[PDB]
Amino acid sequence: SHMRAPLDFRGMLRKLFSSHRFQVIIICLVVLDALLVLAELILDLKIIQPDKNNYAAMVFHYMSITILVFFMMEIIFKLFVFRLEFFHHKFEILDAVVVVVSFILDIVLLFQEHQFEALGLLILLRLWRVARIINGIIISVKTRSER
């Protein structure tokens, strides 16, 4: 529903719990990621090499970009740091655009004429993405804290 729901209250509650459960967040994230990556590794090994580039890659990229952005906003929202005003800045919008080009390029290269290369776009995508997120909260927390 729109124009008929809270925004300041719900935000304080989620931010309150999340903030208080800082350890639970950092740990939950490290685990969720570590498990996801690891699992994908052991599962990918079974394939040995890319002998499809179509269905698997499709669900892989789609599910990847989805979980990536989804989880990104989920965490950033559940627990924010500063966030200049409500509007979005150049850095905020940049992330969106960057992901758009990367994602599109990935799929486009997947169903393109070459094979064995599209996956690369996904790897780098989550790489810089995830890394940026964590590295951001860590560098922001470490720089803010006494240290």
Short mmCIF file of N, CA, C and O in Angstrom, two decimals:
data_model
loop_
_atom_site.label_atom_id
_atom_site.label_comp_id
_atom_site.label_asym_id
_atom_site.label_seq_id
_atom_site.Cartn_x
_atom_site.Cartn_y
_atom_site.Cartn_z
N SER A 1 0.83 -1.20 0.00
CA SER A 1 0.00 0.00 0.00
C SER A 1 0.87 1.26 0.00
O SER A 1 1.94 1.28 0.60
N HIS A 2 0.39 2.30 -0.67
CA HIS A 2 1.11 3.56 -0.75
C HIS A 2 0.32 4.69 -0.10
O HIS A 2 -0.91 4.64 -0.05
N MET A 3 1.03 5.69 0.40
CA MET A 3 0.39 6.83 1.05
C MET A 3 -0.52 6.37 2.17
O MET A 3 -1.62 6.90 2.35
N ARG A 4 -0.07 5.39 2.94
CA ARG A 4 -0.85 4.85 4.05
C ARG A 4 -0.03 3.84 4.85
O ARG A 4 -0.40 2.67 4.95
N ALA A 5 1.08 4.30 5.42
CA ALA A 5 1.94 3.44 6.21
C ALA A 5 3.06 4.24 6.87
O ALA A 5 3.39 5.35 6.46
N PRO A 6 3.66 3.66 7.93
CA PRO A 6 4.75 4.31 8.67
C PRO A 6 6.04 4.38 7.85
O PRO A 6 6.14 3.80 6.77
N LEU A 7 7.02 5.11 8.38
CA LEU A 7 8.30 5.26 7.70
C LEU A 7 9.39 5.68 8.68
O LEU A 7 10.53 5.22 8.59
N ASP A 8 9.03 6.55 9.62
CA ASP A 8 9.98 7.02 10.62
C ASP A 8 10.05 6.06 11.80
O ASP A 8 11.11 5.85 12.39
N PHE A 9 8.90 5.47 12.15
CA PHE A 9 8.83 4.53 13.26
C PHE A 9 9.51 3.21 12.91
O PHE A 9 10.45 2.78 13.58
N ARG A 10 9.03 2.57 11.84
CA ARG A 10 9.60 1.30 11.40
C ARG A 10 11.11 1.41 11.22
O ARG A 10 11.85 0.48 11.53
N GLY A 11 11.56 2.55 10.71
CA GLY A 11 12.98 2.76 10.50
C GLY A 11 13.77 2.76 11.79
O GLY A 11 14.86 2.22 11.86
N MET A 12 13.20 3.39 12.82
CA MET A 12 13.86 3.46 14.12
C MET A 12 13.94 2.08 14.77
O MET A 12 14.94 1.74 15.40
N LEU A 13 12.88 1.30 14.62
CA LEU A 13 12.82 -0.04 15.19
C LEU A 13 13.87 -0.95 14.54
O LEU A 13 14.68 -1.57 15.23
N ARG A 14 13.84 -1.02 13.22
CA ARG A 14 14.78 -1.85 12.47
C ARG A 14 16.22 -1.41 12.74
O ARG A 14 17.10 -2.23 12.96
N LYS A 15 16.44 -0.10 12.70
CA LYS A 15 17.77 0.45 12.93
C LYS A 15 18.22 0.21 14.37
O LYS A 15 19.40 -0.03 14.64
N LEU A 16 17.27 0.27 15.30
CA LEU A 16 17.56 0.06 16.71
C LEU A 16 18.05 -1.37 16.96
O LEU A 16 19.13 -1.59 17.50
N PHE A 17 17.24 -2.34 16.55
CA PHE A 17 17.58 -3.75 16.72
C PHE A 17 18.86 -4.09 15.96
O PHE A 17 19.80 -4.64 16.53
N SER A 18 18.88 -3.77 14.68
CA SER A 18 20.04 -4.05 13.84
C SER A 18 21.31 -3.49 14.47
O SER A 18 22.31 -4.20 14.62
N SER A 19 21.27 -2.21 14.83
CA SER A 19 22.43 -1.55 15.44
C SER A 19 22.87 -2.29 16.69
O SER A 19 24.05 -2.61 16.86
N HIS A 20 21.92 -2.57 17.58
CA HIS A 20 22.21 -3.27 18.82
C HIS A 20 22.80 -4.65 18.54
O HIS A 20 23.68 -5.12 19.26
N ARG A 21 22.31 -5.29 17.48
CA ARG A 21 22.79 -6.62 17.10
C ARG A 21 23.88 -6.52 16.04
O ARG A 21 23.93 -7.32 15.11
N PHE A 22 24.76 -5.53 16.19
CA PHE A 22 25.85 -5.33 15.24
C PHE A 22 26.60 -6.63 14.99
O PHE A 22 26.82 -7.03 13.85
N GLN A 23 27.01 -7.29 16.08
CA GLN A 23 27.74 -8.54 15.98
C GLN A 23 26.94 -9.58 15.21
O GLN A 23 27.48 -10.31 14.38
N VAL A 24 25.64 -9.65 15.49
CA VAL A 24 24.76 -10.60 14.82
C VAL A 24 24.71 -10.34 13.32
O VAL A 24 24.61 -11.28 12.52
N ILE A 25 24.78 -9.07 12.94
CA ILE A 25 24.74 -8.69 11.53
C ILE A 25 26.03 -9.09 10.82
O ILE A 25 26.01 -9.84 9.85
N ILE A 26 27.15 -8.57 11.32
CA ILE A 26 28.45 -8.88 10.73
C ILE A 26 28.66 -10.38 10.61
O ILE A 26 29.16 -10.88 9.60
N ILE A 27 28.29 -11.11 11.66
CA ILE A 27 28.44 -12.56 11.68
C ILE A 27 27.48 -13.22 10.69
O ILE A 27 27.87 -14.09 9.91
N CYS A 28 26.22 -12.80 10.73
CA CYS A 28 25.20 -13.35 9.84
C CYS A 28 25.59 -13.14 8.38
O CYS A 28 25.32 -13.99 7.53
N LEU A 29 26.22 -12.01 8.10
CA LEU A 29 26.64 -11.68 6.74
C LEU A 29 27.82 -12.55 6.32
O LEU A 29 27.79 -13.18 5.26
N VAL A 30 28.86 -12.57 7.15
CA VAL A 30 30.05 -13.36 6.86
C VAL A 30 29.70 -14.83 6.64
O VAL A 30 30.29 -15.50 5.79
N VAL A 31 28.73 -15.32 7.41
CA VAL A 31 28.30 -16.71 7.30
C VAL A 31 27.49 -16.93 6.03
O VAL A 31 27.79 -17.83 5.24
N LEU A 32 26.47 -16.11 5.83
CA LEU A 32 25.62 -16.22 4.65
C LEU A 32 26.45 -16.19 3.37
O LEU A 32 26.25 -17.00 2.47
N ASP A 33 27.39 -15.25 3.31
CA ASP A 33 28.25 -15.12 2.14
C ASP A 33 29.21 -16.30 2.03
O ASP A 33 29.28 -16.96 1.00
N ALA A 34 29.94 -16.57 3.11
CA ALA A 34 30.89 -17.68 3.14
C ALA A 34 30.22 -18.98 2.70
O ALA A 34 30.79 -19.75 1.93
N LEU A 35 29.02 -19.22 3.20
CA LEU A 35 28.27 -20.43 2.86
C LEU A 35 27.86 -20.42 1.40
O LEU A 35 28.08 -21.39 0.67
N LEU A 36 27.26 -19.31 0.96
CA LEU A 36 26.82 -19.17 -0.42
C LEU A 36 27.97 -19.41 -1.39
O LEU A 36 27.87 -20.24 -2.30
N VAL A 37 29.07 -18.69 -1.19
CA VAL A 37 30.24 -18.82 -2.04
C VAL A 37 30.78 -20.25 -2.01
O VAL A 37 30.92 -20.90 -3.05
N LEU A 38 31.09 -20.73 -0.81
CA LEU A 38 31.62 -22.08 -0.64
C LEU A 38 30.73 -23.10 -1.34
O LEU A 38 31.19 -23.88 -2.18
N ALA A 39 29.44 -23.10 -0.99
CA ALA A 39 28.49 -24.03 -1.58
C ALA A 39 28.55 -23.97 -3.11
O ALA A 39 28.59 -25.00 -3.77
N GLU A 40 28.54 -22.76 -3.65
CA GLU A 40 28.59 -22.57 -5.09
C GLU A 40 29.88 -23.15 -5.68
O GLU A 40 29.89 -23.67 -6.79
N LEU A 41 30.96 -23.06 -4.91
CA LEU A 41 32.25 -23.58 -5.35
C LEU A 41 32.22 -25.10 -5.46
O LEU A 41 32.50 -25.66 -6.52
N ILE A 42 31.87 -25.76 -4.36
CA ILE A 42 31.80 -27.22 -4.34
C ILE A 42 30.80 -27.73 -5.36
O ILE A 42 30.99 -28.80 -5.96
N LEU A 43 29.73 -26.97 -5.57
CA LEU A 43 28.70 -27.35 -6.53
C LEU A 43 29.17 -27.12 -7.96
O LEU A 43 28.85 -27.89 -8.86
N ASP A 44 29.93 -26.05 -8.16
CA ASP A 44 30.45 -25.72 -9.48
C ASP A 44 31.52 -26.71 -9.91
O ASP A 44 31.62 -27.06 -11.09
N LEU A 45 32.32 -27.17 -8.95
CA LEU A 45 33.38 -28.12 -9.23
C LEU A 45 32.84 -29.35 -9.96
O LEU A 45 33.48 -29.89 -10.86
N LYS A 46 31.65 -29.79 -9.55
CA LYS A 46 31.01 -30.95 -10.16
C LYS A 46 30.90 -30.78 -11.68
O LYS A 46 30.98 -31.75 -12.43
N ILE A 47 30.72 -29.54 -12.11
CA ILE A 47 30.60 -29.24 -13.54
C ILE A 47 31.96 -29.24 -14.21
O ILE A 47 32.07 -29.54 -15.41
N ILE A 48 33.00 -28.92 -13.45
CA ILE A 48 34.36 -28.89 -13.98
C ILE A 48 34.57 -27.69 -14.89
O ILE A 48 35.40 -26.82 -14.61
N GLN A 49 33.81 -27.64 -15.98
CA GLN A 49 33.91 -26.54 -16.93
C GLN A 49 32.54 -26.16 -17.47
O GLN A 49 31.59 -26.94 -17.43
N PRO A 50 32.42 -24.92 -17.98
CA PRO A 50 31.17 -24.41 -18.54
C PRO A 50 30.79 -25.09 -19.85
O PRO A 50 31.38 -24.82 -20.89
N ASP A 51 29.80 -25.98 -19.78
CA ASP A 51 29.34 -26.70 -20.97
C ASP A 51 27.85 -26.47 -21.20
O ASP A 51 27.13 -27.38 -21.60
N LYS A 52 27.41 -25.24 -20.95
CA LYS A 52 26.00 -24.89 -21.14
C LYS A 52 25.87 -23.47 -21.69
O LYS A 52 25.52 -23.27 -22.85
N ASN A 53 26.15 -22.49 -20.84
CA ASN A 53 26.06 -21.09 -21.24
C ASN A 53 24.70 -20.79 -21.87
O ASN A 53 24.60 -20.58 -23.08
N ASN A 54 23.66 -20.76 -21.04
CA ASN A 54 22.31 -20.49 -21.52
C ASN A 54 21.31 -20.53 -20.38
O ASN A 54 20.87 -19.49 -19.88
N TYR A 55 20.95 -21.74 -19.96
CA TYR A 55 19.99 -21.92 -18.87
C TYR A 55 20.65 -21.67 -17.52
O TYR A 55 20.25 -20.78 -16.77
N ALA A 56 21.67 -22.47 -17.21
CA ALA A 56 22.39 -22.34 -15.95
C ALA A 56 22.89 -20.91 -15.75
O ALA A 56 22.64 -20.30 -14.71
N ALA A 57 23.59 -20.39 -16.75
CA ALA A 57 24.12 -19.03 -16.68
C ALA A 57 23.00 -18.01 -16.49
O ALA A 57 23.17 -17.01 -15.79
N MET A 58 21.85 -18.28 -17.10
CA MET A 58 20.70 -17.39 -17.00
C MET A 58 20.22 -17.29 -15.55
O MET A 58 20.11 -16.20 -15.00
N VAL A 59 19.93 -18.45 -14.96
CA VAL A 59 19.45 -18.49 -13.58
C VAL A 59 20.55 -18.06 -12.61
O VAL A 59 20.27 -17.52 -11.54
N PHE A 60 21.80 -18.32 -12.98
CA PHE A 60 22.94 -17.96 -12.14
C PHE A 60 23.08 -16.44 -12.05
O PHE A 60 23.19 -15.89 -10.95
N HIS A 61 23.09 -15.78 -13.20
CA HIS A 61 23.22 -14.33 -13.25
C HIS A 61 22.01 -13.65 -12.62
O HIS A 61 22.14 -12.76 -11.78
N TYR A 62 20.82 -14.08 -13.04
CA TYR A 62 19.58 -13.51 -12.53
C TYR A 62 19.51 -13.63 -11.01
O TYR A 62 19.26 -12.66 -10.31
N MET A 63 19.73 -14.85 -10.51
CA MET A 63 19.70 -15.10 -9.08
C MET A 63 20.82 -14.35 -8.36
O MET A 63 20.66 -13.93 -7.22
N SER A 64 21.95 -14.20 -9.05
CA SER A 64 23.10 -13.50 -8.48
C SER A 64 22.80 -12.02 -8.30
O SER A 64 22.76 -11.51 -7.17
N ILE A 65 22.59 -11.32 -9.41
CA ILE A 65 22.29 -9.90 -9.37
C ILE A 65 21.14 -9.60 -8.41
O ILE A 65 21.18 -8.61 -7.67
N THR A 66 20.12 -10.45 -8.43
CA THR A 66 18.97 -10.28 -7.56
C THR A 66 19.37 -10.31 -6.09
O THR A 66 19.18 -9.34 -5.36
N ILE A 67 19.95 -11.44 -5.66
CA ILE A 67 20.38 -11.59 -4.28
C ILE A 67 21.39 -10.51 -3.90
O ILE A 67 21.41 -10.05 -2.76
N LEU A 68 22.22 -10.13 -4.85
CA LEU A 68 23.24 -9.10 -4.62
C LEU A 68 22.59 -7.78 -4.22
O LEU A 68 22.75 -7.30 -3.10
N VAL A 69 21.84 -7.19 -5.15
CA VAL A 69 21.17 -5.92 -4.90
C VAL A 69 20.18 -6.04 -3.75
O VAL A 69 20.15 -5.21 -2.85
N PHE A 70 19.36 -7.09 -3.79
CA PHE A 70 18.37 -7.33 -2.74
C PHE A 70 19.02 -7.29 -1.36
O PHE A 70 18.64 -6.48 -0.51
N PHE A 71 19.99 -8.16 -1.14
CA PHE A 71 20.69 -8.23 0.14
C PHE A 71 21.36 -6.90 0.46
O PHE A 71 21.41 -6.48 1.62
N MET A 72 21.87 -6.24 -0.57
CA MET A 72 22.54 -4.95 -0.40
C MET A 72 21.62 -3.95 0.29
O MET A 72 21.94 -3.43 1.36
N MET A 73 20.48 -3.68 -0.33
CA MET A 73 19.51 -2.74 0.23
C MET A 73 18.97 -3.24 1.56
O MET A 73 18.72 -2.45 2.47
N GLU A 74 18.80 -4.55 1.67
CA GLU A 74 18.29 -5.16 2.90
C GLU A 74 19.16 -4.78 4.09
O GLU A 74 18.65 -4.36 5.13
N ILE A 75 20.47 -4.93 3.94
CA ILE A 75 21.41 -4.60 5.00
C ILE A 75 21.52 -3.09 5.19
O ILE A 75 21.34 -2.57 6.29
N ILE A 76 21.83 -2.39 4.10
CA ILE A 76 21.96 -0.94 4.15
C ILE A 76 20.74 -0.29 4.79
O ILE A 76 20.86 0.71 5.50
N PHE A 77 19.57 -0.86 4.55
CA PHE A 77 18.33 -0.34 5.11
C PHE A 77 18.18 -0.75 6.57
O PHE A 77 17.93 0.09 7.44
N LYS A 78 18.33 -2.04 6.84
CA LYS A 78 18.21 -2.56 8.20
C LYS A 78 19.15 -1.82 9.14
O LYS A 78 18.81 -1.57 10.30
N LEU A 79 20.33 -1.46 8.65
CA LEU A 79 21.32 -0.75 9.45
C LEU A 79 22.08 0.26 8.60
O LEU A 79 22.96 -0.11 7.82
N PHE A 80 21.75 1.54 8.76
CA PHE A 80 22.40 2.60 8.01
C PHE A 80 23.47 3.28 8.85
O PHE A 80 23.54 3.09 10.07
N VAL A 81 24.31 4.09 8.20
CA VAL A 81 25.38 4.80 8.90
C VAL A 81 25.11 6.30 8.93
O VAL A 81 24.83 6.87 9.99
N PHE A 82 25.18 6.94 7.77
CA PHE A 82 24.94 8.37 7.66
C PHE A 82 23.85 8.67 6.64
O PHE A 82 22.74 9.06 6.99
N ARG A 83 24.18 8.48 5.36
CA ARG A 83 23.23 8.73 4.28
C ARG A 83 22.83 10.20 4.24
O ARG A 83 21.91 10.63 4.93
N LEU A 84 23.54 10.97 3.42
CA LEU A 84 23.26 12.40 3.29
C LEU A 84 21.83 12.64 2.84
O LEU A 84 21.46 12.32 1.71
N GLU A 85 21.02 13.19 3.74
CA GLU A 85 19.62 13.47 3.43
C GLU A 85 18.91 12.21 2.94
O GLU A 85 19.45 11.11 3.00
N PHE A 86 17.68 12.38 2.45
CA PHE A 86 16.90 11.26 1.95
C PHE A 86 17.20 11.00 0.47
O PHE A 86 17.35 9.86 0.05
N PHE A 87 17.29 12.08 -0.30
CA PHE A 87 17.57 11.97 -1.73
C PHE A 87 18.82 11.13 -1.97
O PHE A 87 19.57 10.83 -1.04
N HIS A 88 19.04 10.76 -3.23
CA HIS A 88 20.21 9.96 -3.60
C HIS A 88 21.29 10.83 -4.22
O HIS A 88 21.00 11.76 -4.97
N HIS A 89 22.55 10.52 -3.91
CA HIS A 89 23.67 11.28 -4.45
C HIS A 89 24.22 10.62 -5.71
O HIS A 89 23.68 9.62 -6.18
N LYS A 90 25.30 11.18 -6.24
CA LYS A 90 25.93 10.64 -7.45
C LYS A 90 26.50 9.25 -7.19
O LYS A 90 26.47 8.38 -8.06
N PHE A 91 27.04 9.05 -5.99
CA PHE A 91 27.62 7.77 -5.62
C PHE A 91 26.55 6.69 -5.51
O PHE A 91 26.78 5.54 -5.88
N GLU A 92 25.38 7.08 -5.01
CA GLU A 92 24.27 6.14 -4.86
C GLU A 92 23.75 5.69 -6.22
O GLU A 92 23.65 4.49 -6.49
N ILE A 93 23.43 6.65 -7.08
CA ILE A 93 22.92 6.35 -8.41
C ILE A 93 23.96 5.60 -9.24
O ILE A 93 23.63 4.72 -10.04
N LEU A 94 25.23 5.94 -9.04
CA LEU A 94 26.32 5.30 -9.76
C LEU A 94 26.25 3.79 -9.63
O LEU A 94 26.33 3.06 -10.62
N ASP A 95 26.10 3.32 -8.39
CA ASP A 95 26.01 1.89 -8.13
C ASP A 95 24.97 1.23 -9.03
O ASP A 95 25.23 0.19 -9.64
N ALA A 96 23.79 1.83 -9.09
CA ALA A 96 22.71 1.30 -9.92
C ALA A 96 23.14 1.18 -11.37
O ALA A 96 23.07 0.10 -11.96
N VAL A 97 23.58 2.29 -11.95
CA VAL A 97 24.03 2.30 -13.34
C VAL A 97 25.11 1.26 -13.58
O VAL A 97 25.02 0.45 -14.50
N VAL A 98 26.15 1.29 -12.75
CA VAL A 98 27.26 0.35 -12.87
C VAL A 98 26.75 -1.09 -12.96
O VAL A 98 27.14 -1.84 -13.85
N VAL A 99 25.87 -1.46 -12.03
CA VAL A 99 25.31 -2.80 -12.00
C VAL A 99 24.53 -3.09 -13.28
O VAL A 99 24.57 -4.20 -13.80
N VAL A 100 23.81 -2.09 -13.77
CA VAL A 100 23.01 -2.24 -14.98
C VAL A 100 23.89 -2.63 -16.16
O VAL A 100 23.59 -3.59 -16.88
N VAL A 101 24.96 -1.87 -16.37
CA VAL A 101 25.88 -2.14 -17.47
C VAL A 101 26.55 -3.50 -17.31
O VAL A 101 26.65 -4.27 -18.27
N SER A 102 26.99 -3.80 -16.10
CA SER A 102 27.65 -5.07 -15.81
C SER A 102 26.71 -6.24 -16.08
O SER A 102 27.04 -7.17 -16.82
N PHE A 103 25.53 -6.19 -15.47
CA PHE A 103 24.53 -7.25 -15.64
C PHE A 103 24.21 -7.46 -17.11
O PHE A 103 24.38 -8.55 -17.65
N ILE A 104 23.74 -6.40 -17.77
CA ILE A 104 23.39 -6.47 -19.18
C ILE A 104 24.53 -7.05 -20.00
O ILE A 104 24.33 -7.96 -20.81
N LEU A 105 25.74 -6.53 -19.78
CA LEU A 105 26.91 -7.00 -20.50
C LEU A 105 27.14 -8.49 -20.26
O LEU A 105 27.55 -9.22 -21.17
N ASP A 106 26.87 -8.94 -19.04
CA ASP A 106 27.04 -10.34 -18.68
C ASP A 106 26.11 -11.23 -19.51
O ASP A 106 26.56 -12.13 -20.22
N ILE A 107 24.81 -10.97 -19.40
CA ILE A 107 23.82 -11.74 -20.14
C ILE A 107 24.05 -11.65 -21.64
O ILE A 107 24.01 -12.65 -22.35
N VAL A 108 24.29 -10.43 -22.12
CA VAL A 108 24.54 -10.20 -23.54
C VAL A 108 25.72 -11.03 -24.04
O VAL A 108 25.68 -11.58 -25.14
N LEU A 109 26.76 -11.11 -23.22
CA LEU A 109 27.95 -11.87 -23.57
C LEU A 109 27.70 -13.37 -23.43
O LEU A 109 28.34 -14.19 -24.10
N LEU A 110 26.77 -13.73 -22.56
CA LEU A 110 26.43 -15.13 -22.34
C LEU A 110 25.77 -15.74 -23.57
O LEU A 110 26.18 -16.81 -24.04
N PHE A 111 24.76 -15.06 -24.09
CA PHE A 111 24.05 -15.53 -25.27
C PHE A 111 24.70 -15.00 -26.55
O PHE A 111 24.11 -15.08 -27.63
N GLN A 112 25.90 -14.47 -26.41
CA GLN A 112 26.63 -13.92 -27.55
C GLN A 112 27.42 -15.02 -28.27
O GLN A 112 27.24 -16.20 -28.00
N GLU A 113 28.29 -14.61 -29.19
CA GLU A 113 29.10 -15.55 -29.94
C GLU A 113 30.52 -15.62 -29.38
O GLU A 113 31.41 -14.90 -29.83
N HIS A 114 30.72 -16.48 -28.39
CA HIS A 114 32.03 -16.64 -27.77
C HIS A 114 31.98 -17.71 -26.68
O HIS A 114 32.81 -18.62 -26.65
N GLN A 115 31.01 -17.59 -25.78
CA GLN A 115 30.86 -18.54 -24.68
C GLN A 115 32.08 -18.51 -23.77
O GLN A 115 33.14 -18.03 -24.15
N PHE A 116 31.91 -19.03 -22.55
CA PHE A 116 33.00 -19.07 -21.58
C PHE A 116 33.63 -17.69 -21.42
O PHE A 116 34.76 -17.46 -21.84
N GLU A 117 32.88 -16.77 -20.81
CA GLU A 117 33.37 -15.41 -20.59
C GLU A 117 32.32 -14.57 -19.88
O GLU A 117 32.65 -13.70 -19.07
N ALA A 118 31.05 -14.83 -20.18
CA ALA A 118 29.95 -14.09 -19.56
C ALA A 118 30.03 -14.17 -18.04
O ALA A 118 29.85 -13.16 -17.35
N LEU A 119 30.29 -15.36 -17.52
CA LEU A 119 30.39 -15.56 -16.08
C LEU A 119 31.31 -14.53 -15.45
O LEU A 119 31.08 -14.07 -14.33
N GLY A 120 32.36 -14.16 -16.17
CA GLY A 120 33.31 -13.18 -15.66
C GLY A 120 32.62 -11.93 -15.15
O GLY A 120 32.94 -11.44 -14.07
N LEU A 121 31.68 -11.41 -15.94
CA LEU A 121 30.95 -10.20 -15.56
C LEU A 121 30.29 -10.37 -14.20
O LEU A 121 30.25 -9.44 -13.39
N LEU A 122 29.77 -11.57 -13.94
CA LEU A 122 29.11 -11.86 -12.68
C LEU A 122 30.11 -11.87 -11.53
O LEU A 122 29.88 -11.26 -10.48
N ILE A 123 31.23 -12.56 -11.73
CA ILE A 123 32.27 -12.64 -10.71
C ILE A 123 32.72 -11.25 -10.27
O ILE A 123 32.70 -10.93 -9.08
N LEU A 124 33.11 -10.43 -11.23
CA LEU A 124 33.56 -9.07 -10.94
C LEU A 124 32.44 -8.24 -10.32
O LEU A 124 32.66 -7.42 -9.43
N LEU A 125 31.22 -8.47 -10.81
CA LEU A 125 30.05 -7.74 -10.31
C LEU A 125 29.92 -7.91 -8.80
O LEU A 125 29.97 -6.93 -8.05
N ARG A 126 29.75 -9.15 -8.35
CA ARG A 126 29.61 -9.44 -6.93
C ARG A 126 30.89 -9.09 -6.18
O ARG A 126 30.84 -8.68 -5.02
N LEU A 127 32.03 -9.25 -6.84
CA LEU A 127 33.32 -8.94 -6.23
C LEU A 127 33.35 -7.50 -5.72
O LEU A 127 33.40 -7.26 -4.52
N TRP A 128 33.33 -6.55 -6.65
CA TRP A 128 33.36 -5.14 -6.30
C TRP A 128 32.15 -4.76 -5.46
O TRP A 128 32.25 -3.98 -4.52
N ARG A 129 30.99 -5.33 -5.81
CA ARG A 129 29.76 -5.05 -5.09
C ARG A 129 29.89 -5.42 -3.62
O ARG A 129 29.96 -4.55 -2.75
N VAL A 130 29.93 -6.72 -3.34
CA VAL A 130 30.05 -7.21 -1.98
C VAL A 130 31.21 -6.54 -1.25
O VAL A 130 31.05 -5.98 -0.17
N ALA A 131 32.39 -6.59 -1.86
CA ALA A 131 33.58 -5.99 -1.28
C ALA A 131 33.32 -4.54 -0.87
O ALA A 131 33.64 -4.14 0.25
N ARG A 132 32.73 -3.77 -1.78
CA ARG A 132 32.42 -2.37 -1.50
C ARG A 132 31.53 -2.24 -0.28
O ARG A 132 31.80 -1.44 0.62
N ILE A 133 30.46 -3.03 -0.24
CA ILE A 133 29.53 -3.00 0.88
C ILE A 133 30.25 -3.22 2.20
O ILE A 133 30.28 -2.33 3.05
N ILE A 134 30.82 -4.40 2.37
CA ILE A 134 31.55 -4.74 3.59
C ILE A 134 32.64 -3.71 3.88
O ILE A 134 32.65 -3.07 4.92
N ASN A 135 33.57 -3.56 2.93
CA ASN A 135 34.67 -2.62 3.08
C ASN A 135 34.15 -1.24 3.48
O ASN A 135 34.84 -0.47 4.15
N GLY A 136 32.92 -0.93 3.07
CA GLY A 136 32.33 0.35 3.40
C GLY A 136 31.90 0.44 4.85
O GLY A 136 32.22 1.40 5.54
N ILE A 137 31.16 -0.56 5.31
CA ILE A 137 30.69 -0.60 6.69
C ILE A 137 31.84 -0.75 7.66
O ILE A 137 31.82 -0.19 8.76
N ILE A 138 32.86 -1.51 7.26
CA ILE A 138 34.03 -1.73 8.10
C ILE A 138 34.88 -0.47 8.21
O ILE A 138 35.23 -0.04 9.30
N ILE A 139 35.20 0.11 7.06
CA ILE A 139 36.01 1.33 7.02
C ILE A 139 35.28 2.49 7.68
O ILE A 139 35.90 3.38 8.26
N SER A 140 33.95 2.48 7.59
CA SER A 140 33.14 3.54 8.18
C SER A 140 33.02 3.36 9.69
O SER A 140 32.98 4.34 10.44
N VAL A 141 32.98 2.11 10.13
CA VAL A 141 32.87 1.80 11.55
C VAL A 141 34.21 1.96 12.25
O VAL A 141 34.30 2.52 13.34
N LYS A 142 35.27 1.45 11.61
CA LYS A 142 36.61 1.54 12.17
C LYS A 142 37.08 2.99 12.23
O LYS A 142 37.75 3.40 13.18
N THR A 143 36.73 3.76 11.21
CA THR A 143 37.12 5.16 11.14
C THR A 143 36.32 6.01 12.13
O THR A 143 36.81 7.01 12.64
N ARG A 144 35.09 5.58 12.39
CA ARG A 144 34.22 6.30 13.32
C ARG A 144 34.57 5.96 14.76
O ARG A 144 34.69 6.84 15.61
N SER A 145 34.72 4.67 15.04
CA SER A 145 35.05 4.21 16.39
C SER A 145 36.34 4.86 16.88
O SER A 145 36.97 5.63 16.16
N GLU A 146 36.71 4.55 18.12
CA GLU A 146 37.92 5.11 18.72
C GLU A 146 39.13 4.86 17.82
O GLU A 146 40.04 5.69 17.74
N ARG A 147 39.14 3.71 17.16
CA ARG A 147 40.24 3.35 16.27
C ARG A 147 40.06 3.99 14.90
O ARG A 147 40.42 5.15 14.69
#
